[PDB]
Amino acid sequence: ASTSRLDALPRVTCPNHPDAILVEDYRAGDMICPECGLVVGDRVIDVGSEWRTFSNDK
């Protein structure tokens, strides 16, 4: 079904650096692998959105 926005996560760590947990925002950008320092991502506009809270009002 193509109804869901995305809610998808990046690739399990760096493809070449398993220990290098590509951090968020490469110096204020995409995903940076502190090891190779690769930048993955482009325009995320914050995806997901699942509320995840306790008790609702409306």
Cβ neighbours of 22 (radius 10 Å): 24
Domain count, the chain: 1
CATH number of the CATH domain containing 24: 2.20.25.10
- What is the CA 6 to chain-centroid distance, rounded? 11
How many whole angstroms separate alpha carbon 51 and alpha carbon 54? 9
How many whole angstroms separate alpha carbon 22 and alpha carbon 12? 9
**The dihedral sign for the CA sequence 41, 47, 50, 51:** positive
Technique of determination: NMR
For residue 48, what are the domain limits?
1-58
- Residue 44 contacts by C-beta under 8 Å, 6 or more apart in sequence? none
DSSP single-letter state for residue 32: E
Residue 36 is assigned to a ligand binding site: yes
DSSP single-letter state for residue 31: E
Residue 11 is assigned to a ligand binding site: no
Residue 17 is assigned to a ligand binding site: yes
What is the chain's length? 58
CB 1 within 8 A of CB 10: no
Residue 43 is assigned to a ligand binding site: no
How many whole angstroms separate alpha carbon 57 and alpha carbon 39? 40
Cα 17-18-21 angle, rounded to 5 deg: 85
Residue 14 is assigned to a ligand binding site: yes
